[PDB]
Structure formats: C-alpha cells, structure tokens
C-alpha cells in the first residue's frame, strides 16, 4: 500500500479578478493541463498580479484574497494543501478549520488589501465571475444580498473579498445562505478574525 500512496496536489493560481481599473473582470492565466501539471510539481513560475486570485485544486475552483501580506482562502476548498510557487510548494502559514480559514505568505507580485477600520455596514462582494454585488452587513459574519441570486451564481466564490466603499477588506466570503436554491444572504469571515489570527 505504502509504495503507491498518492499525495494531494498543491493549490494552483489559475487566474485573477482584475479590480485595477474601471471594470471588474476575470482573467485566466493557466488552462487545465498546466494547472494539473503545476498542482503535481508545486512549481508555478507565472507572474502573480492583483489582490484576488482564482485558485484550483483537482476538484474545485474558488478564490483567494491577499490581505496584509497573506493570501487567504477557505479551509473547505484548500484543506491543508500547499500552494504552488516559483520556488516549489509553499506550506500554509495559517490553518484554522474552526474559522474555515487558511493562509499562505502572499505571492511576490500580488497586492494586498488593507483591513477596514471604517466600522461601516455598506459592503460589496466580488464573485469568481467578477460581479461586484452590494451586500448590507447584518452582523459580524453575515450580510444580506440587496438582490437575491440562485446559489449557482455564488458557487466558487468562497475565498473572495467583501469590501467597504473605500475598498478596504471587510471579510472573506465563506458560504451562501440559501432557501430553495436562492441566496439572500452570505456568511463571511470578518477581517478582524484574520487580524487576530495574524497577531
């Protein structure tokens, strides 16, 4: 049994959500074959740019967001996996199954969002398809969608950011709250929880 035991691959950056300009849009930087190879080696020589990465395992594609020099995502997507990097696989710097949170050192080339200090409740969720959806904050870890969507619309957005009007990071999207397939609210990991994890 031992000789044939497999290893899980690395998480692989396969694109980004470009927020650098007037228009939000998803860009793909690696196709499926390159992703599969890179997951195996853990060696990714692609140049990273931006705050929000699109990331993949063998089974899921989701998001990861840089805040304070850490690339954050959800445990339910990444598990305990390494992330591929120019120098080989990079081990998680944070792992917290209870928070549904993991982090790696932010890749060179990435830009980080700053944690929000505004203490305000009018937010914006960035999805894996680069939609920017208004969300009213309803508690420390929940927000309501101003316009409800089918859950399919949010699938694969876990790990992406909720932002304040000034563009600071307020949280990391975790899960939709749904009834009969329709999302009217979102659960997120508040940035203060990340800040506690960091300090």
């Amino acid at each position: 049994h031992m000789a044939s035991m497999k290893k899980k691959g690395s998480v692989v950056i396969v694109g980004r959500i470009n927020l650098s300009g007037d228009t939000a849009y998803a860009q793909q930087t690696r196709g499926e074959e390159g992703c599969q190879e890179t997951s195996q080696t853990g060696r990714d020589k692609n140049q990273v740019e931006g705050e929000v990465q699109i990331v993949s395992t063998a089974t899921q594609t989701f998001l990861a967001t840089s805040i304070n020099g850490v690339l954050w995502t959800v445990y339910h997507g990444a598990g305990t996996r390494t992330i591929a990097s120019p120098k080989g696989p990079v081990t998680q710097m944070y792992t917290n199954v209870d928070k549904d949170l993991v982090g790696w050192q932010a890749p060179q080339g990435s830009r980080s969002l700053t944690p929000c200090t505004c203490g305000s409740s009018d937010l914006y969720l960035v999805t894996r398809h680069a939609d920017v959806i208004p969300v009213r904050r309803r508690g420390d870890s929940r927000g309501s969608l101003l316009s409800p969507r089918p859950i399919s619309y949010l699938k694969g957005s876990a790990g992406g950011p909720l932002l304040c009007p000034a563009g600071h990071a307020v949280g990391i999207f975790r899960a939709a709250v749904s009834t009969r397939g329709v999302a009217k609210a979102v659960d997120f990991i508040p940035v203060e929880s990340l800040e506690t994890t960091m300090r």
Binding site: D100, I151, L154, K155, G156, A158, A175, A176, T179
Partner: peptide
C-alpha cells in the same frame, strides 16, 4: 434553513 459552503 439553510447554508452551503461556496
């Protein structure tokens, strides 16, 4: 209900 990890 309910909830669904995304």
């Amino acid at each position: 209900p309910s909830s669904t990890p995304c």
